[PDB]
Every structure is written in structure tokens, then in C-alpha cells.
Subunit: 160 residues, 4 copies
């Protein structure tokens, strides 16, 4: 790519490999190593993509947006947070997309790109969320806590 | 925890939540938010843990080691790389553990903790590997390439 | 402090040591190791402080602002950029404050806190500027270039 | 350069601009923007160079070494620490070079490239040291403390 690849790749059902690059693009690479397409964001893509059931590719960007990209490389939507999105998204069973932001919030975004809820931690959320079998969302914060957040966006507990 | 939680949590079969902390520990937290155990490495744990089929927890540390920790919090083994292990391990179908290192290599480590092979890129491997259906290992590098490596440790292709 | 001290300390004329912390504060510490004061910003202070000729302390914050703090620990002014200010400010002979931002610009800010000019690079400006004898401002960018900018904000040259 | 320029430039007496690059080189650039020379280290140069009284250029590398490079671009010596040297060196009145390392130590190195002392903190030393009028060396650590070290390498105080 044109820059450091710190983003961690994700693999689609047809074998397409998606990865972000410091050069600001989300890349879609065919299994044979040739470019399928590249999608330009406004900043470094350190966030690692996640792939929804319908093939939508979600990734954060240093330009403060969470991107939802169709398998053809055209934008589905982008959601603006208050700060760099270095956290990597996780997708719930109903399609909700969860991601942390440098602006200290954990975001829950509906598949349509509208905010479901946002939960304020005390510091940047660089950690990438994990979703439990019951739907609990776990994520670390720069504020030293591991958070457990219920599906409705309320604190379950925080572990110092 | 005692420090920033940049590591991304992983959830075990019984619901235990594992996460690293900048305070040098790998944490195991019960579903109720109470400590199960904390394992001290020699440096910040920014790497995100992966869980094997038998419940072993693998994570890298800034102290240059890849750790394999038993579900009870006791060390199974540790493997020394040449630099900080910020990359998050991936586990193959056969149990091979793949992880990047700041020393520029992608490591393949067998379940018993012995090196299978190491693949030298041109720069730090902070990207976390993904594994395709056919066993190909994909990982980004600070040298600007996305690498596709065969399970035998030989290059398939690299995408600038 | 309450968090990692990645910021690099600066020493005032009277020996006071100033440093930022990941806990969001700018610290002013007496030579005997006791707190003089701490100033809370909205986010991690990774930027390293610079000290003006009248003792004003300038530092960037993860909350996107460049801060000017009086020697007594009270805010003089804060200037909002479009992104995290990890770059460390430099002070020109005339008192102009130069600092990079995650929003890709090198900023020149007058002593009164108003914009003098902003220069657009191709990527995040984490590098901290240096000032030559003739006033040229040098800074690196995530876009791979070392920039030389004239005092009037116009490009002198860019070295790939 | 061939990669991101996160290193902060330093300016020599003749106006030469020195800066590290993520492409592993330390660059020396003439005031007119043309390359004077480049020196290859083994890893990314995020550390910001310092210039000694005699013109020696000191800089850390992600390859774990502190480099001393002569004005003509030839290696004078390199000093191996136990981890990445992202801290930027400072030079004391007697020529001692101080720098932090990811291996948790603050290093004091003699001008001949041999160890004077190293001081163990509780975590990675990414902060760049500053030197007070009486020779006290101040540096932050990932362990949350600002350290004040006497010139003999013994603790003066640490500020949480």
C-alpha cells in the first residue's frame, strides 16, 4: 500500500481480504493478491475492519468517522464521532455495530448508520469491543477500566 | 486495572473475559466483574488475547514474549521473539499460533510452544494476522505491505 | 501522576518542571518534587510543553486544543484544531507558536491565541516543529515528507 | 522519505536539518531541501535527534540502539539497549547522553559510547529527558511517574 499497514485484515465470504493502511485507504484485495478496490477515507485507517452478514465492511478512520462500505467499494454510510476511531468494530447478532472512539465514548450504531446509543468512559477508547453470548459488550478504556456494557447501553460493571 | 487498557478483550467458553493492561498484567475477569486472576508479564500487554480450543489463552507482551497461559492463570509456556509483541495472535485450525513482532517477523508457533517458522518482513509487524479457509495467513507490516504467507512459512504474495 | 507520562518535561527559569500526563493534566512540579499546580485538559497530554519568554507554558492535548497556561496555572487561552495535538509546540523569536495536529495541518498561532496561518500537509503532523535561524519552520508529516515552511505559511520545500 | 516522519527535526549550526523516518533512516538535509546524507538503522527512527557540541548527532531507533553519527554521516558508535529507543536523547554539560528505552531504563551513556549508568523505572521510558541547571535529569515513565535522577544515577525523587 502507500503506507504502514497497522490495521489487521478481515476475510470475506468470497475470500476477499480487507485491510486499512496509513495511506488513508481501506483496501479490498482479491485472494490472488491483485487489487479489487481501495476506498479513500480522510485519514489513516488503523482500525481493523469487520464484515457484516450482508457483506458490508465496517472500519474506523483517524478522520473521526466509522465507515460502512458496500462489497463493491461504494460508501453505504459514514458516522461521525468526536475523535479518531482507532478501535476496531464488532457486530452484534442484530447487526448493531459497536466501536470505541478517541472522544472517550463506546458507540452502538444501528445497521442504518443512525446512533443507537453512546456510553461515556473516562478516556480514549482504543480497545476493540467484544460481544458476549448474552450481548454484553466488553471494552477497555485509557481510563484504566475494563467496561461491561449491557445491550441497552447502561453500565453493567467496570473493573479497575 | 492498574493502567490503560488498550488490549481488546476475548471471551472464554465459560464467560471469563480476558484482557491485557498497560500495567503489565493479563487479566481474567469473571462475568460478574470480580477478578478471577491476573498474570504478570514483564511489560505492557497491548496485544489482544486469543483463546484455544482447550481454553489456553495466548497473548503478546511488550517484554518480547508470546505467552500461553492455562485457564487457571498459571503459565503453560512463553516464546521469546526479538521485540515487543503488540500484534494479537491468531490460532489456526491445527492449533498453530501466528503473531507478529516488532522485530519485523511473523511467527508461527506450535501448540507445544516450539517455533514452527518465522517469516521476515521489512518492518515491524503490529498488524494481527488473519487465516483464510485454505490456511493462508494474512498480515500487514510497517513496511507498507499486506503479506499472504503459506502455512509452510513461504511467501504467497505481498501487496504494496 | 494518574497515568503514563509520555510527555517530555520542560524546565522553567525558576526550576519548575512541566510535563503532561495520560491522566489529562499538565503538571507543574517544584524542584523538590512537590506539586506546584496541575491543569486539567479534556484528554491525554502527550504533547511536550514549551515555555515562552514571559513564562507562559504551551502544550497540546488529545482533546484537539493547543493550551497557553499562565505560570500561575490559570488558562491564558486555548486554540481549537481539528484533531488531537500530539505534536510539541515550538516558539519563534517573535513569540509565534507552531504546532502540528492530527488534522494534517501545521498551525502558526500568535501570542494572543489567534490563528496566524495553517499549512496543510498530506497527513497527521505528529512531528514537533523546529525553527531555523532565518525563521523557516521544519516539521515531519505522516505523509512521509519533511516540510520546510516559510514564516508566511507558504511552502519552502518538501523532502520525500 | 520512504515513510512517515514522526521524528522531530533538529538543526545544526550550519543549518543542516536532521530527522528520523519510519523508513529506518536518519536524514541530513541541506537548507535548500537537497539530501546531504542518510544513515540506515535497523528499524524505524521515531526518536528525535540531538546534536552535541562537536556536531555529533544522537538518535534512538526501534532496532533498540542509541546511535551516535558523525557530521559526515558515518557511524561513530551504537549502544544496544534492551528495547526500542523511542525517547529522544538529551546531552548534559559534560557530554553525557541521556535517553529512555522501552526496556524501562533511563540510560546515561558516555561520549565514547560506553555505559555510565542506567536507572530502572517501572515501565517503558518513551518520555525524552530534560536536564536542570544543577544536572538533575527529569523524565517520565509509562509507570505513571515523573522521575528526577541525580547525575550519579541515583533517585532524587519520583512524582506520582
Amino acid at each position: 500500500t502507500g503506507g504502514s499497514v497497522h490495521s489487521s485484515p478481515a476475510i470475506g465470504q468470497d475470500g476477499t481480504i480487507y485491510v486499512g493502511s496509513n495511506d488513508h485507504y481501506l483496501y479490498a484485495i482479491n485472494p490472488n493478491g491483485k487489487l479489487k478496490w481501495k476506498f479513500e477515507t480522510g485519514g489513516s485507517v488503523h482500525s481493523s475492519p469487520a464484515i457484516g452478514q450482508d457483506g458490508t465492511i465496517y472500519v474506523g478512520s483517524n478522520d473521526h468517522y466509522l465507515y460502512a462500505i458496500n462489497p463493491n467499494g461504494k460508501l453505504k454510510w459514514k458516522f461521525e464521532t468526536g475523535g479518531s476511531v482507532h478501535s476496531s468494530p464488532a457486530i452484534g447478532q442484530d447487526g448493531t455495530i459497536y466501536v470505541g472512539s478517541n472522544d472517550h465514548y463506546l458507540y452502538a450504531i444501528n445497521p442504518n448508520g443512525k446512533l443507537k446509543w453512546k456510553f461515556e468512559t473516562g478516556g480514549s477508547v482504543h480497545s476493540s469491543p467484544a460481544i458476549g453470548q448474552d450481548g454484553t459488550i466488553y471494552v477497555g478504556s485509557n481510563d484504566h477500566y475494563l467496561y461491561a456494557i449491557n445491550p441497552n447501553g447502561k453500565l453493567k460493571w467496570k473493573f479497575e
